[PDB]
Design a protein around this nucleic acid. Structure first.
Ligand SMILES: [Ca+2]
Ligand SMILES: [Ca+2]
Ligand SMILES: [Mg+2]
Ligand SMILES: [Mg+2]
Ligand SMILES: [Mg+2]
Ligand SMILES: [Mg+2]
Ligand SMILES: [Mg+2]
Ligand SMILES: [Mg+2]
Ligand SMILES: [Mg+2]
Ligand SMILES: [Mg+2]
Ligand SMILES: [Mg+2]
Ligand SMILES: [Mg+2]
Ligand SMILES: [Mg+2]
Ligand SMILES: [Mg+2]
Ligand SMILES: [Mg+2]
Ligand SMILES: [Mg+2]
Ligand SMILES: [Mg+2]
Ligand SMILES: [Mg+2]
Ligand SMILES: [Mg+2]
Ligand SMILES: [Mg+2]
Ligand SMILES: [Mg+2]
Ligand SMILES: [Mg+2]
Ligand SMILES: [Mg+2]
Ligand SMILES: [Mg+2]
Ligand SMILES: [Mg+2]
Ligand SMILES: [Mg+2]
Ligand SMILES: [Mg+2]
Ligand SMILES: [Mg+2]
Ligand SMILES: [Mg+2]
Ligand SMILES: [Mg+2]
Ligand SMILES: [Mg+2]
Ligand SMILES: [Mg+2]
Ligand SMILES: [Mg+2]
Ligand SMILES: [Mg+2]
Ligand SMILES: [Mg+2]
Ligand SMILES: [Mg+2]
Ligand SMILES: [Mg+2]
Ligand SMILES: [Mg+2]
Ligand SMILES: [Mg+2]
Ligand SMILES: [Mg+2]
Ligand SMILES: [Mg+2]
Ligand SMILES: [Mg+2]
Ligand SMILES: [Mg+2]
Ligand SMILES: [Mg+2]
Ligand SMILES: [Mg+2]
Ligand SMILES: [Mg+2]
Ligand SMILES: [Mg+2]
Ligand SMILES: [Mg+2]
Ligand SMILES: [Mg+2]
Ligand SMILES: [Mg+2]
Ligand SMILES: [Mg+2]
Ligand SMILES: [Mg+2]
Ligand SMILES: [Mg+2]
Ligand SMILES: [Mg+2]
Ligand SMILES: [Mg+2]
Ligand SMILES: [Mg+2]
Ligand SMILES: [Mg+2]
Ligand SMILES: [Mg+2]
Ligand SMILES: [Mg+2]
Ligand SMILES: [Mg+2]
Ligand SMILES: [Mg+2]
Ligand SMILES: [Mg+2]
Ligand SMILES: [Mg+2]
Ligand SMILES: [Mg+2]
Ligand SMILES: [Mg+2]
Ligand SMILES: [Mg+2]
Ligand SMILES: [Mg+2]
Ligand SMILES: [Mg+2]
Ligand SMILES: [Mg+2]
Ligand SMILES: [Mg+2]
Ligand SMILES: [Mg+2]
Ligand SMILES: [Mg+2]
Ligand SMILES: [Mg+2]
Ligand SMILES: [Mg+2]
Ligand SMILES: [Mg+2]
Ligand SMILES: [Mg+2]
Ligand SMILES: [Mg+2]
Ligand SMILES: [Mg+2]
Ligand SMILES: [Mg+2]
Ligand SMILES: [Mg+2]
Ligand SMILES: [Mg+2]
Ligand SMILES: [Mg+2]
Ligand SMILES: [Mg+2]
Ligand SMILES: [Mg+2]
Ligand SMILES: [Mg+2]
Ligand SMILES: [Mg+2]
Ligand SMILES: [Mg+2]
Ligand SMILES: [Mg+2]
Ligand SMILES: [Mg+2]
Ligand SMILES: [Mg+2]
Ligand SMILES: [Mg+2]
Ligand SMILES: [Mg+2]
Ligand SMILES: [Mg+2]
Ligand SMILES: [Mg+2]
Ligand SMILES: [Mg+2]
Ligand SMILES: [Mg+2]
Ligand SMILES: [Mg+2]
Ligand SMILES: [Mg+2]
Ligand SMILES: [Mg+2]
Ligand SMILES: [Mg+2]
Ligand SMILES: [Mg+2]
Ligand SMILES: [Mg+2]
Ligand SMILES: [Mg+2]
Ligand SMILES: [Mg+2]
Ligand SMILES: [Mg+2]
Lengths: 117, 63, 144, 137
RNA sequence: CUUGACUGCGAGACUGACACGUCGAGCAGGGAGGAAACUCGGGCUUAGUGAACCGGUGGUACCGUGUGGAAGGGCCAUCG
RNA sequence: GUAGGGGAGCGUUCAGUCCGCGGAGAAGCCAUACCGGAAGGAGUGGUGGAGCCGACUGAAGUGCGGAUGCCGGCAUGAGU
RNA sequence: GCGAGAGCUAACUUCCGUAGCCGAGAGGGAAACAACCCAGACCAUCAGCUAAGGUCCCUAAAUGAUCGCUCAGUGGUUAA
RNA sequence: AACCGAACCUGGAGAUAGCUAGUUCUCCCCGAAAUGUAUUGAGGUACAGCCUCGGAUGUUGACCAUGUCCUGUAGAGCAC
RNA sequence: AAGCUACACCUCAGAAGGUGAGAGUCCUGUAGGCGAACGAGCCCUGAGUAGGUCGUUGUUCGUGAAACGAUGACUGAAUCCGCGCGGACCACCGCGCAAGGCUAAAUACUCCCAGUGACCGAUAGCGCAUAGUACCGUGAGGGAAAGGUGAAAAGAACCCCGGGAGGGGAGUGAAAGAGAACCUGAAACCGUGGACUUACAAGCAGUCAUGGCACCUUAUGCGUGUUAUGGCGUGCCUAUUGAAGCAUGAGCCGGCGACUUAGACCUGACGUGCGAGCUUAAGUUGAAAAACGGAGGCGGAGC
RNA sequence: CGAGCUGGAGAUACGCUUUGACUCGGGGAUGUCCGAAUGGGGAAACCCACCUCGUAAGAGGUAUCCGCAAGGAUGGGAACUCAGGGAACUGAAACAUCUCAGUACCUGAAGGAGAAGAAAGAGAAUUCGAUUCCGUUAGUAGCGGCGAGCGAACCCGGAU
């Protein structure tokens, strides 16, 4: 019994090719560059996911001291003074509190400063 | 098929026993010898160790 | 069926190549193709006699009809074998294997789509196992 | 029984090694190692300096007796067994050779076996228990 | 003064991938020196060396092809 | 986690047995946002116009990105 | 890196010893950078703590507090 | 008879190739070596050494402490 | 209509092929039966020898203790109380009659024919779905690609633009979404139209994040397509101490393309049968099937 | 056999056929020229003759080697058989003996087969009983730079 490759290879190739949407040029049309681009793209997808965690970390922080200094203290002497205010621990995305309710972020500034005295 | 390597047979390598490979003791054949009388005698029958698997298939039918 | 040496070992600028008759060519020569061979091997005797015994045994859950003679077929005509079987629950919702001794009696129905004949000897751990029932008939082989 | 439902004993067939055929295992270089004389093959059980050549003490012939140790011989219950009955009753497979017996633990009751020759100390323990042994005159 | 510059052995260990190499108490046959205990199986020790194959010389009586021998071969010792 | 050893598996053709499907339309092809831990598998629609899926067992010419690999088609250089 | 020979107390030299790394090791730091510093990645999270290394703006985080020092851009290229 | 230190064709013939290149489905578990000897040996092999699988045994393994013996480097010294 | 359905029927015949799609009962056939004038076919018993020396050689026979047969050169016997051999050679003991011829069957092969296939099905299979052609060579010699309207030609009268080629209609046909560049018709490649986009931009071509604009058939969502902008980001393989490497390979896509087979062979793991015992080989007979066959092989005694 | 037929051929005209076509089975008879080629020559398929037949047109003969003579041979065959010749790459991890292997190849002869064949044998039982083939003996006995490696037979079981 002979068992030629037919239908198998086209199906595999077409699944690779379909992963290529708006890939530029022969990235979208030739199988070999499509598959090769996907190897490097693997690298990027995994690394980036882990990194995106750390990137939103950064955006968080960068808003929080901007509001903090608007109230006359930096990030450092703030997220300290909430933690030194101990039970105050809300921590996760204080960014949004600073970015939408300033009546609240002002009270948190007063709390941190009271804790540092 | 499968030959025995007849270089194994009347040469040292008795196959015999609990499956282990005896061989002889070698130096001072009939090449010249002054040398000691307690070595000229201690050349009777040795038995090798970590090569046996090679020796066996030289002669697995025990010729 | 092809030739020679093809051209320049070095210097043509084309790839290396040697003759037109190799598997890397789309010409000819399968590398590791089928060649004629035999697959038959002497299976040990104890196991095939145990096999047919187990096969007959497997039909004692629900199956295996009479080993004896039961031939009221008008010399040899299928419609009358169909009637004989139809009185035994062999209406042919189930394929059935028959074994016997009289050419006159198996000849009755070599045709019918359910049954197939085999003479005494020439039984088959596969045949009796692949039909849905066994009309053992021929009592001689059945008893010793 | 259902041929659909036949099933070989688990563990009685294992699959072949498909060497090549992926980076899911056994990639590129096959089972093989990389370079070296491992490639389209040859050369046997030979080290290609000096293969442990030890000297050769030699004598060509041999011819050995067929064995009947008498430890089975005593539980035998049947006694006075001439040995041409024995090859054609059990034991002593060899047609090309001659038969011999030998001491194995006990002897016990009487018997009389006509073997081609036997150990002298069988006569030390077959003659006791009132038994003859016929070397083939 | 004389040969222990011995025959049959080798419990145990050092050392080496092997194959080789090293040391050896003690047992037998027979010696040697000593009054004895005892020490002798080469040299204070560590270099002075070659596997295997094929053959020469001396013993032994194992093999020896129908049998009885012999040719030839094996074993022990040695030489190249 | 590289050579390497081990484990469990996906898909292709052929064969045996079963369950079936098909001109009110089969394989193949085409699109797709569903499913499975992966190999993959289904749903629906478009095309096609005569065969074919699923399950269990068996046997393999059984899985390609490379080989200045082969055959074929088509591009770049260029309206040069 | 440490301990040595060879070398010119040369070399991203060569040859041994020794530990660790790369080899097969992703992640953070060292501008970039196999080997150096921190640390060994089963999968997911728009949650929290630290290591090396950092906190003027590129660029996450003290234009931090207290004593001094250097007015050379020393910092940000050797010596007699 | 458009490539002559030995023509062309067909055959042995799938010459041989310790040398180059290539060797394709999937997830899971473990995970090396570039050392030592020998080699008409040095980019090749054989045996060790390091990996894995299965069986047996069953803490015999690992660091660390205490006890004990072995050593002639660092340093130092001038008694050879 | 052969499929579905409902009622029947044959079967020594339900093997198969054809027939507008899948037919036991429509055709050809099948089981079975018949079947030709000429037709093919089961006192003797071997001499230039036997034997020998020189060179050699064949069988396991490589000058080895090397017999025996074999001839190239030179020699050269004996008769039935005789002749050859039994692996230097001798005696004994055995086997056999050389130098004359013929001889069926069991064996091999496959140009040719039949049947069959866990054989191919258009880059496979023979080189050829036919061709030793075309084509290449002075020659010997080498050597291609090869396919498909439709059930049936009913193979497109007539009209329209065009010298034609080509097309558009009308017809036929189930279909012309089959029209003779005639089954399906992938991909690379070339175009036309549309959505979203792009003319201060530095770029292994992605990836992740967020805004914009479209869209709504596994689909109003943790959607789909496409964008702008930020962060991050050194092709793939091979070969390597070390590859984005200015080191190898590769224009692209399609298809072809590499760990196999064999043998009573060795050695292990797993599984089955029978177990102190297990098993057959060649073959014989039966084959829509397998039984028989102990010759022989492995354990069982070692040194 | 019992109505079609007129090759593939698909294109018409022309016919033929139930006093049997066409097709199938079996015989006859024609059979240009070359080709073993063979009357002589030759660059195959073309040139040139002679002798009897003899009315012509046409027919028949004319090579060599075997044999008195009949009658035979010459050439051609995919592979298979036997014979006369007889390699080398290769393996031996180099190479001389050795292997590859009496393999490939060339040549001769023959057939449906061929070869071989009726014991001055095998062989160690005073067993056997022409040859060939298969199984096993057995990789045993042996051969061998005693290296690489090569490798019987008898007994026994079968085909005949
Ligand atoms: Ca222009
Ligand atoms: Ca230009
Ligand atoms: Mg990234
Ligand atoms: Mg935080
Ligand atoms: Mg022995
Ligand atoms: Mg090029
Ligand atoms: Mg072919
Ligand atoms: Mg197999
Ligand atoms: Mg296998
Ligand atoms: Mg694996
Ligand atoms: Mg490689
Ligand atoms: Mg090769
Ligand atoms: Mg070999
Ligand atoms: Mg050497
Ligand atoms: Mg036995
Ligand atoms: Mg004294
Ligand atoms: Mg002593
Ligand atoms: Mg001698
Ligand atoms: Mg003798
Ligand atoms: Mg002698
Ligand atoms: Mg449909
Ligand atoms: Mg799909
Ligand atoms: Mg149709
Ligand atoms: Mg293949
Ligand atoms: Mg690859
Ligand atoms: Mg390619
Ligand atoms: Mg091309
Ligand atoms: Mg120096
Ligand atoms: Mg260096
Ligand atoms: Mg490496
Ligand atoms: Mg590491
Ligand atoms: Mg790193
Ligand atoms: Mg880094
Ligand atoms: Mg960085
Ligand atoms: Mg730097
Ligand atoms: Mg560096
Ligand atoms: Mg790295
Ligand atoms: Mg923190
Ligand atoms: Mg710190
Ligand atoms: Mg900042
Ligand atoms: Mg400051
Ligand atoms: Mg020229
Ligand atoms: Mg030319
Ligand atoms: Mg040349
Ligand atoms: Mg080649
Ligand atoms: Mg060859
Ligand atoms: Mg060579
Ligand atoms: Mg691990
Ligand atoms: Mg050494
Ligand atoms: Mg090396
Ligand atoms: Mg090893
Ligand atoms: Mg283990
Ligand atoms: Mg221990
Ligand atoms: Mg411990
Ligand atoms: Mg010092
Ligand atoms: Mg039909
Ligand atoms: Mg019907
Ligand atoms: Mg005569
Ligand atoms: Mg002669
Ligand atoms: Mg001679
Ligand atoms: Mg010789
Ligand atoms: Mg003689
Ligand atoms: Mg002779
Ligand atoms: Mg003799
Ligand atoms: Mg097929
Ligand atoms: Mg073809
Ligand atoms: Mg084609
Ligand atoms: Mg051809
Ligand atoms: Mg020409
Ligand atoms: Mg021509
Ligand atoms: Mg057609
Ligand atoms: Mg046209
Ligand atoms: Mg027209
Ligand atoms: Mg119509
Ligand atoms: Mg159209
Ligand atoms: Mg169409
Ligand atoms: Mg046209
Ligand atoms: Mg069709
Ligand atoms: Mg088409
Ligand atoms: Mg356009
Ligand atoms: Mg456009
Ligand atoms: Mg500008
Ligand atoms: Mg702009
Ligand atoms: Mg630009
Ligand atoms: Mg972007
Ligand atoms: Mg390099
Ligand atoms: Mg690099
Ligand atoms: Mg480049
Ligand atoms: Mg490159
Ligand atoms: Mg290179
Ligand atoms: Mg290039
Ligand atoms: Mg066997
Ligand atoms: Mg054989
Ligand atoms: Mg007719
Ligand atoms: Mg016609
Ligand atoms: Mg002529
Ligand atoms: Mg002629
Ligand atoms: Mg003539
Ligand atoms: Mg040569
Ligand atoms: Mg060689
Ligand atoms: Mg030679
Ligand atoms: Mg041949
Ligand atoms: Mg010939
Ligand atoms: Mg001939
Ligand atoms: Mg016989």
């Amino acid at each position: 019994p002979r068992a030629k490759t037919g239908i198998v290879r086209r199906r595999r190739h077409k699944k690779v090719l379909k992963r290529a949407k708006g890939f530029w040029g022969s990235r979208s049309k030739q199988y070999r560059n499509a598959f090769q681009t996907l190897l490097n793209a693997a690298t990027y997808e995994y690394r980036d996911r882990r990194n995106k965690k750390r990137d939103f970390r950064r955006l968080w922080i960068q808003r929080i001291n901007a509001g903090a200094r608007l109230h006359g203290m930096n990030y450092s002497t703030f997220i300290n003074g909430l933690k030194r205010a101990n039970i105050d621990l809300n921590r996760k995305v204080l960014a949004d509190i600073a970015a939408r309710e300033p009546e609240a972020f002002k009270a948190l500034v007063d709390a941190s400063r009271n804790a540092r005295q | 098929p499968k030959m025995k390597t007849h270089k194994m047979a009347k040469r040292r390598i008795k196959i015999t026993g609990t499956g282990k490979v005896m061989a002889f003791k070698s130096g001072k054949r009939h090449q010249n010898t002054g040398k000691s009388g307690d070595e000229i005698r201690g050349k009777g029958k040795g038995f090798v160790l970590a090569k046996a698997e090679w020796a066996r298939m030289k002669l697995m039918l025990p010729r | 069926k092809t030739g020679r040496k093809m051209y320049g070992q070095k210097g043509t600028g084309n790839a290396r190549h040697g003759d037109r008759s190799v598997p890397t060519f789309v010409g000819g020569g399968v590398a590791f193709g089928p060649k004629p061979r035999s697959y038959d091997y002497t299976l040990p005797r104890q196991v095939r006699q145990l096999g047919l015994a187990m096969a007959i045994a497997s039909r004692q859950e629900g199956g295996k009809l009479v080993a004896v003679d039961g031939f009221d077929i008008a010399d040899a005509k299928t419609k009358n074998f169909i009637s004989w079987a139809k009185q035994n629950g062999l209406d042919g919702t189930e394929k059935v294997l028959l074994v016997t001794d009289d050419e006159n009696t198996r000849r009755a129905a070599r045709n019918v789509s359910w049954v197939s004949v085999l003479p005494v000897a020439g039984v088959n751990v596969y045949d009796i196992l692949r039909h849905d029932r066994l009309v053992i008939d021929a009592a001689a082989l059945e008893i010793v | 029984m259902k041929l659909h439902d036949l099933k070989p004993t688990p563990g009685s067939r294992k699959d072949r090694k498909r060497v090549g055929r992926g980076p899911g295992g056994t990639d590129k270089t096959a089972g093989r190692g990389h370079k070296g004389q491992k490639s389209r093959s040859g050369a046997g059980k030979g080290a290609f300096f000096e293969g442990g050549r030890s000297r050769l003490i030699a004598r060509l012939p041999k011819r050995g007796f067929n064995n009947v140790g008498t430890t089975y011989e005593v539980v035998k219950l049947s006694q006075l067994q001439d040995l041409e009955d024995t090859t054609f009753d059990r034991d002593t497979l060899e047609a090309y050779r001659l038969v011999r017996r030998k001491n194995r633990p006990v002897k016990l009751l009487a018997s009389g076996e006509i073997s081609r020759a036997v150990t002298v100390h069988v006569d030390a323990a077959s003659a006791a228990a009132i038994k003859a042994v016929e070397a083939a005159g």
